[PDB]
Structure formats: structure tokens, C-alpha cells
Symmetry: D2
Subunit: 352 residues, 4 copies
Amino acid sequence: MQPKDTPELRALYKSFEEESIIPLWTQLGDLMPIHPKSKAVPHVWKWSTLLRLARKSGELVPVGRGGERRALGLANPGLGGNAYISPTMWAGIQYLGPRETAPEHRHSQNAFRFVVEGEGVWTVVNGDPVRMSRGDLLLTPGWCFHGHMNDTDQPMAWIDGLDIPFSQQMDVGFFEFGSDRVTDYATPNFSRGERLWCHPGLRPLSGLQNTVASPIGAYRWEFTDRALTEQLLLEDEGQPATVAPGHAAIRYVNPTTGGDVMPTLRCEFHRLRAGTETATRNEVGSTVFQVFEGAGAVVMNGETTKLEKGDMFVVPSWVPWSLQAETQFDLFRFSDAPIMEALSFMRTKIEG
Amino acid sequence: QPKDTPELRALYKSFEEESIIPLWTQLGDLMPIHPKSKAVPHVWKWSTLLRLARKSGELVPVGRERRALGLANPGLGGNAYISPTMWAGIQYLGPRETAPEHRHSQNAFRFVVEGEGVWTVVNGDPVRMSRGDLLLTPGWCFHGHMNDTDQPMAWIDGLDIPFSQQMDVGFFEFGSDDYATPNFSRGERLWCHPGLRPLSGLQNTVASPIGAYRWEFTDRALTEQLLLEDEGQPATVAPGHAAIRYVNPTTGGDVMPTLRCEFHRLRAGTETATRNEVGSTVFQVFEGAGAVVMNGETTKLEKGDMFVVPSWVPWSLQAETQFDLFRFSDAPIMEALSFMRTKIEGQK
Amino acid sequence: QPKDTPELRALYKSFEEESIIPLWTQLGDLMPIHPKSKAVPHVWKWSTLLRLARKSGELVPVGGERRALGLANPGLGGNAYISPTMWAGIQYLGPRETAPEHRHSQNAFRFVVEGEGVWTVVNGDPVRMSRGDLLLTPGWCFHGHMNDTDQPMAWIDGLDIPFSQQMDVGFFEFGSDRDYATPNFSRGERLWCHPGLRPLSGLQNTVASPIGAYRWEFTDRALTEQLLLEDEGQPATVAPGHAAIRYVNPTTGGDVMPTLRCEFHRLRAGTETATRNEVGSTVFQVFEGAGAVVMNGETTKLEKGDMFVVPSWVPWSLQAETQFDLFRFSDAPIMEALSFMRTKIEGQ
Amino acid sequence: PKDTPELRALYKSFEEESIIPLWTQLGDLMPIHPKSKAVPHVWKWSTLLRLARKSGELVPVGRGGERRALGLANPGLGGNAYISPTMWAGIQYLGPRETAPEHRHSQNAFRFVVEGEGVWTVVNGDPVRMSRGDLLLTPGWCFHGHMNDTDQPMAWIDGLDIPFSQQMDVGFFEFGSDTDYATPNFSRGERLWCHPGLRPLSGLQNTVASPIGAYRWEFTDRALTEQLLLEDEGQPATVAPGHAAIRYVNPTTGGDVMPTLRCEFHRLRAGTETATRNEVGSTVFQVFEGAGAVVMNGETTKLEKGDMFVVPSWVPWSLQAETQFDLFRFSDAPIMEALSFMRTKIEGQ
Ligand SMILES: [Cl-]
Ligand SMILES: [Cl-]
Ligand SMILES: [Cl-]
Ligand SMILES: [Cl-]
Ligand SMILES: [Fe+3]
Ligand SMILES: [Fe+3]
Ligand SMILES: [Fe+3]
Ligand SMILES: [Fe+3]
């Protein structure tokens, strides 16, 4: 507003209200901001806290009661009690107890599982049984049947990433329950997907068709490790490879395409040489990082926070960020960048 | 229902104290069986809109930053979103009024309803405006406009404002950094020759270089589809239903990354087959009369009226007279991200 | 740089039996420093062509029916290829003459030079022909034609015949099918020739353009606009005084067919294009006006109708004496799909 | 055609004006279906090897010699040295401690190693070790030379789009000076790109040809074994029963290794007979291990370790495996597919 206030002016606004009209001129210039100004706020979650609350939940929330969906969603303080870590992503610590099972469902929302501690648990994706290990990235791409079974007396914890907040806000979700059909879990070290698609530079003649989401069920830790190590080795030998000095990094990729793992979520993994400081970045859309191994710190909006093994933080859109590595510093990273990029909304500013 | 009320509420005090919401005590269906939008089917009478528009010209002066009446969906909590993704508003430009140049990441179009002799200048290139024309002001293009007449004009503004706001994607720069008045923009003179492409424009483009999709061509196109059907030839999307998509000529795809525009002409008496579609559309009755059915409920429609079909709401159109509709939607978003799904009642 | 007799002669014989040819005995120009085509720069004067075409008019009667004079490149050993990839012939259709429908994997167009009132029927869709029109008969579409006039017509036939023969890619079928109707404009154009608009019934992208005829009015207007824009100080022409368009597939923005690019150029009187080296072949046809070509430093004066071929990597430029209108086709889509295109421009 | 009177002296003018008329013309300018001048043919490895070794001490470094490559010449291509209208296939014989200086050409090339080791092909400065079973790429416009670091010979298959490139006038060539002699176990390429499902953040840009310098035999063999094992386990994986196969692909894209050549590898279970296929364009196969037979135009030819054969366009072909039968395959299919000329007839359908 800025029409000089008036009995008739007020009459007008009355009739708006009454006809579902909201006028653009009274409309708080956050409607069209000079740059992104997210409701979501930068925030870190200490792993020691997450872990403690995870365990206690597996002492108090049994199957039948609340367990079954035993996942601690990280809720962004800025998102009015929604349980969104960012406008576009859901990130939760899922705590799977001894011998525990989940029946099969399917949903349009895209999802991954990054395993933090544990082993001997299979997520069965479209009938294909996928083993889980510390450091593995698992995909359960939209509209693929998934459930899981813990084959062990030991608990497991993984990060659950989904595009739930995007899909809720944009009205895009469907959900189906599995038929009464029986999932008699096989137990293989390697899923059929991996056995077919995890041979570098080779494609089976039976998979000539490109796919919207990756047919790789798990991107195993051995390969991620090997690839980052090799990037640092190359650097030592004076060869081009790292994204920036002392900065090893890979993007997990759909092999049929070279593109992202799934339409709405990008996954990366970074390894910072001890003492590396990344150049400050402004990026459209939101990212979540989790510290896999090592210790260092983040800077967001000029403010520093020390990080250790397991901690997670989110950088909402256009918040300037950089990472500083005390030790060798290994991070897992997911973002909503494919959304941004598909729609030409991506922009990047680099301090350097 | 959740775990035993076993004063574990000590655990809850903790969840709360450092920002955890457990999935298990969780909300409504945070993953619905099919979409159930907070946005709700709604129509706006043109009579109403125009009355209100004319008022805003009398009351809210010198054109402030903009005399645009955004259609607010009742179900989106006073946000000024016609749908979770799109902003649709009636903009009323008074006699001889002008707007300085701005530029924003949000994509926009302008569909002219009544008026003429108004130029929107896009990246320096002056684009005349007429009843029935579709104007693009693609993301990040400078735009402003001048009214060269004593007469008002009204057009509808479509933008991805809601998408942009909720997705944290918006940038904005000011301009007033060309009041020439040609019949046709530099872009139409270059691009509006069927099947031809300038050798200076071999680069494909994110959004269409066509500044204005003029009514002449839209009308001839549709008339030709109906003629062809009369002649027993394939053309119409469904019997008695002619339709086009406005497209980016460098690409054959949608006009902008984020918004699809179409235009429909239904023969009198036509009833479209009921459809469920992911995402929202907004239709505007350009000419003629008939009705919409949304969620089994009928609403009679007259020249100018607008309605919104939020995602997965089953809809059909029924044409009383020959029924001309302009249509825009968030379908490109849905399609680029493989979320599109379509259910059509006749089978198809 | 070679080995030398006795026991060696034994080897060269074993080779010859066992079908080996050694790399070393082979000529360096099996992998040349840059392209050196067997095909050679050459022009054909229109007056010649037309004289011969008419003479063929009498002298070979509908006997006749494949009455097309293929331009044979002196350097291609009596093959009837204008270049290693393309066939260009002048087709002379006599009064009231027709041709039955066939179909072949080889892509084809027809650029009409003189005449009217002839239809080429493409997949059942009747397409009128006029001076200046470009007609497409994409690979694997049925085509035949009917002259409905007492007057002859002459058009250029462009095809990938030489590419298709050397690459083993040809199929051919005869047409035992039924239409002699006479529409002013075809179904394809009726649907696709509205700038920036796409029928909802044509959402699928297609490998070759669905525009049957790219008519002269549109090409002419397009090029005039490009020169007008230039006059007005506006970006448009591809180089000073050089208007030009590429005929494109509207579903795509890409080339008319997988195998052949079509362009049209209009040079302002007095223009001299900068010398170009391009991979692959072009044929140009002077549509109106006069000027000259330079190829390998050698000038040839050109008048209305003349045609010339610039084989791969031969340096070429055009100079316009009057306003100079040229039709142009090339094998560049082949070159570009396979990342073999490279381009050198004298000024750069 | 027509008549004779004063037709003869018009035909004259044509000759003078350089016009061939459409009408007087072998109707196989536009054939019912492809009928290649190139002809089905097989080359016995034992012959290839003997002639390669003879060319050993007879054409040495200097006088010939750095181009010691025996191109397989298709009987039907009039003495051209083209195995097919599109491809050059030769056995290259690299003698002990022999080297080639660096060159660069628009024509795309690969090297499939048949016998030997301890030879490096250096691609754009990046040293690529060679072993039996490895596929090396030297994509168009990349600098390549090699050094043999061994007193032993090596033999590899040279595949190129030379014939395509010469008939289509597409060839460029530069000499290099230019050259590192280092001997790493794995090319820097491989070290960046050979981690399944992973892509370096320094390599986000897609490339026209694969950046993998060598597709090593370990991975080829493991992938094939796995497809057969999956079949055993009742799981979908093989292309047809008993028929494991992969396509070597550009990891930035999922597409072919280079714009103009496709490379595949086949492993047929003992006893397998593939279903007869007509395919547009040409293909060359090399028996890597095992024995069986080809059928081409209904005619059988028994095949042994190393043998090579070419199926020109639209010639109906099948393979029959006596033992387990491993084949390397390359084709001009990317050309045919880019230009929508590809067509496939398969016998079971
Ligand atoms: Cl295949
Ligand atoms: Cl539609
Ligand atoms: Cl050019
Ligand atoms: Cl990044
Ligand atoms: Fe799930
Ligand atoms: Fe604006
Ligand atoms: Fe034909
Ligand atoms: Fe070479």
C-alpha cells in the first residue's frame, strides 16, 4: 500500500477480501525479492544428539506402537513446524532396530538412503534385494516398490532423503501399498542392478533404453573411496582432476545418461585435504551435507560452526557457504539443484 | 495411534529443544494416495473482475508497484496464489500510464483481453498489444510498458511467482536504464515466418524469442483445424475440439521453462471427456459461453471468466455456443521432473 | 619410404590372395592433411539446363516420366553425383503429365523454379507447387504427382542418393494405393504454418518436418524483414547486407530432414561474402538477380537460374551485382551429427 | 529408354554439359533393399598372424614400417583396402622396442589388443597401457603415438572410419612435436572415469567421444560372467538366451564410444545359436576366444580363435557357438542411427 488511506480506499480492499482478490501493490516486496530470502534458515544438527535421540526412540517406540516409521525428520526452525529441512527436501535419521522389517510400498516422491552405521540390512527395490553398509548410497527412485529387512541383531541407522516437501507443496504425490504378496528376502552381497550396471564404461545390450532414474541400486563406499583417493593422487602428481585445490569430489550419476541419480535430487560426495578452505559460494536452491569422516567447520552467513563425524547441516538458497577442513574431511551431499537446473533458475556466485 | 503416553515426553522435550519432528507422531497424510491440494477449484466472474479493475484505476493512483488484481485461491491461506505454482492477476492500465523497466527471474506472460495501443518493451524491443494477443516476458528480460492512448487496457498477468517464492528462486533488478511504436516487434519480424529460422538465430533459446503470439494466427489456426475436421481429416484433439500450444520456435517446446500456454476452441455443444491431471491449470473464457465441471460440480461460464483447476481435480468443459478458451498451466514443471500423470474418462 | 624386392615380392603376393592391403604401400592422401575431394567446383548455366530440359521434353515422352537431368560432377567418374553426398537434377514435367506413387529411404526435396498448377501428393496429402516453393518428400513417405495444366514445370530435385548408395542404406517400394484433389494449401501446412503455434494433435516430435511446402511468400517476407531490420540499425542479418534463413523442422527447430540442410540467402546489391572453408558439400541455385562465385580463387559470373557446387573445404565467397537471391542445400546435417563439421572464415 | 534418331546428338550435349539423365540408369541406384558392393568375407587369424610376422623383419622402422598395419581389404570394394564401405580394419604388428611419433586426425580410431603387453599408446599426453583384451580409443582429433617398452612384439586390431571419411571428404591430419614416455599401470583417464556410477566434479561437461582411454579386459570379462550367472539364477540380463553382451559406452552420455563407431562384446554359451539378423550398415567381428561358426547368406564358415569377418549391410547373419564363444564387435551403426537409416529384421519375429 501507498495509496493515501481513505474511507473509499478501505471500501475497495473490503471488496477484494470479499472476491478473493489480493492486490499486487500492497504486496510485500518479499513477493519478488531482489535475491532469494528463504523462510528456511541455516542450521546444524550434532550427530551425538541425533544418535542419542535415535537410540532412545528404539527403546520406546516399538513395532505396533510408533516404530515402523521410526525416522527422525530434521525440521528447519524457519519452516513453521513443517518437518522440512529445506523448502524442497526431507532429511531424516531412520533407526532400524534388531530383526525389524518394513512392508513394501511405492510413491511418486523420489528417495535415497545413505547408510551411516550398521550392516546386514537389505532394502528390496522392485524385487531386487540390495545389501546396506556404512558409506553406501541407495536409491529408491519414485514409483519403485521398496521395503526392507534387518537380518541382524544389531541396529542400523541411515539418512533418509526425499523430495517430500517439494511434492507436498506442488501437489505431486501418489502412494500405493504392496499387494499381500510375499517378500521372501534373498540375501545377496550385490543386487542384480549392480551386477549389471557397475562395470565402468560398459552397458548391457538388454539395457539400451535410457531411464529417468538410475538403475544402480547402491553406489557402494569402496568405489566412492577409490575415486576420491585417485583424484587426490592425481593432484599430488600435478595432474588435473580435483574441482579446486585439495578438493576431491564426485557426483553420483545415472549411468544411462551421465545426469543426476533422480529427477529431483542431486547426490555428491566431497573429500577435502586437511587444511583446505573452500571458496565462499552463493547457490540457488538448498543443499544438505553430512560429515561422513573427519572434522572441520562450516561458514554460513559469515558464522562458523565446528563439525564432527556425523553432523548434518543445510544451506538454504543463496546463503553464502564454505567449508574448512581440520582433518581430511569427507562429506556426503544432496541438493534440489536438478529442480533448479531443469527450470533454468540455477545461478552461482563464487567469492574467488 | 502412537506409543504409550509413558512420560517419554522427556524425549519429546528433547526433540523440540533441537529441531526433530518424528515421522511416527506425524501430521495428516504427508504422502497422499493421490494429490489433495490445499488449493481449491474456483471461478472468478469477469463482470466482477472488470468492475473491481475500473475501481482500482479511480482509486489507486499513477499506476502503483502496479495496478494488478491477483486472483487469490481461497484454500491457500491468504497468499495471493491462484494455484500453488502460478500467479494470475488482472492488470488495469489507465490512459497514458507507463511503467519503468524491471527484470526478474520469475517467468511471465501477458494475455490481452480488452484494449489496444499499448506497447510492452522487452529487452529494448517494443511489442504492441491487442485483444487476443499473448505476450511473453521470459525470466530475466527487462520489461516495461507505455499506454499510447486515452483508453484503458486490461490484460491477464501469468507468472510463476508462487513457485518462485516457495522454491527460493527469485531475483529482481530495477531498470529505467524506447517509446517507439511499431506494429510488430523485432522478434516477430524475425521469427514469425512459418517453418523459417534466421541464420543469425541458430542458437536454441531457453524461452521463446517470440514476443507476441498474435490473435490473427491463433484464430486462423483453430478455424483451420475445425475446417479440416469438417473435411473428414485428422486435426482436432478430440471431436469438435480444436486446440494449439504456443511454442518456442527454436525448440518446438513450451514458451517458457515453467509455464505452458494453450488455446482451445470448442464447437457449440461439445463436452470434453473428464480429466485428472497433475498440477494446476487456469483457463480464461475468451469468447462464447458454456460451463466447467470440477469435482462433479457445474459452473456456468461467460466471456471473460477465469477458473483454476488445482492438481488431480477431475474437470471437463461444456460448450453452449462456440467456446474459445485461453489456457496456461504448470505442466512444464511437472513434465521436466517426471511427475506428470494423466487420467482421461473416455479411456484415452 | 618403402621396403624393396626378393622375399618381399612373396609377401605382396600372399597379401593379394588373402585380401590384405598394407597401410604403407598406400597413398598419404588416404588420410589427407585436409579434405581434397574427388569432386570438383563447377557451375551449370541455367540457359543450358533449360534448353536441354525442353529438348528432353520433345524427344522423351511419358519412355519419359523419370525426366530429370542429374548434374554430374566431372570429378566423380561418371557417377551422376553433383557431390559425394548429393543428387541434384532438373526435373522437367510436361503438360498434363503424372507420376505414380513410390517411396524410398532416401530423403528428397523439390525446389520449384518455373511453373504452377502441379501437385505432389505426399502420404495422401496434396501439395500445390509454385515458383519459389520448397517441397519436402522425407525418407519413406509416399509421393507421386499430377500436372493439372497445359504448361510445363521445372524444379530442382535434391536427394541423398549418392550418400545412400555408397553407404548401403536404400530401400524402395512401389505404390498400389488410391487422390487427385486440388487444394490450394495442404493439410500439413494447414496445421503447421502458423508461427509459434503447435497443434495439440501434433505433440510428438518427428524426424523430418511435417511441413510439405515452405512457400515463397514467407521466405520472401522473412528476408525482406531481415534487410529492413538492418536498415533500422537492428541485429538480424547474418553478416552486413546478408539476409538468410534456414528451413527448419517446426517440431524441433532443426533441419528439414536428417540428411539435407536447406537455406535461402538474399544478398544486398554490392555485398561480398567473406571467404569460407566448410566441411562437406553445398549446392546453390541462383533464384533471382546476378553476381558471381569465387571458388579456389577463380571467379564465375552467375545469372538467374545457374547452379554451382562447392565440394568439401573448397574456399568460397559470393559477390552480388544486383540484389542476389540464392537457394542452398548441403550435407551439413551429416557432417554435424557426426562431429566432422569444421569451419574457417577469412576475417574470422 | 526411348528411340535413336537425333536422340544420340542430345546425349552428346549431355556429355559436353556434364549431365547424366535420370532415365538411362541401373535401377539399383535406388535398390529394393541394400545390395552392397562389399561382400561377406572371413580372414583366418593363423594367416593374419603369419603375414604379420613376415612383415616383421621385411618392412622395418624407416622404409615403410612405422605404418606396419595390414588392412583387410574387402574383395568387393575394387582394391580399396576397405573392409566395409565405412570402416578400415587392419592388424597392426608392433615389433620389439618400436615407437611411433604423435599424429592427430579427424577420423575416429580404436585399438583392440589381441596378443602382447607392455606397450603404451599416449593419448593427448596421457599414457595408456595395452594388454590382450583391452579396447583403446583414440577419438578423432586426439594426439596419439606409442612406444613398445618390451623385447616382445604386440598385435592389435586397428579400427577406423577411414573409408567413411575419405568418401565423405571429412579428413584432416596434423603431425605433432610434441611427448612423455612415463609407464603408469592405468591412464589418468581411467583413474578419473573408471569408478562405476561416479563422475568427477571436474568433468561435468559432456564430451563427444568417451574420455575412457582403455576399457580393460578385467571389467569386460566380469560383466559378461555376471550376465551368464544372472541367467543361471533365473534373472533377466542376457540379450537372448545363452547370449551375454555389453556395449562399450561413453560414460558422460551412455551413448557410443565415438560419433561414428559402435563397439560391443559378446559371450555365447556353448551350443548357442543366435537368431538370424538383417541390419542396415556394416559390422566386423573378431573371435577373441573359443570356437564356433558364422552363417552369412545361408553359408556356414567355421571360426577359430582370432578369426575376423565382416557382415556388409543387410546381409542376414547368425553366430553358432561350439565352445564358449567370445566375440569383439564394431559397427558403423552410430552413423546409421544418427541419420535414421537404421532398420533391423530379426528372425524370431
Ligand atoms: Cl546390437
Ligand atoms: Cl493437453
Ligand atoms: Cl554457411
Ligand atoms: Cl557442485
Ligand atoms: Fe518409502
Ligand atoms: Fe514484471
Ligand atoms: Fe521419389
Ligand atoms: Fe593414427
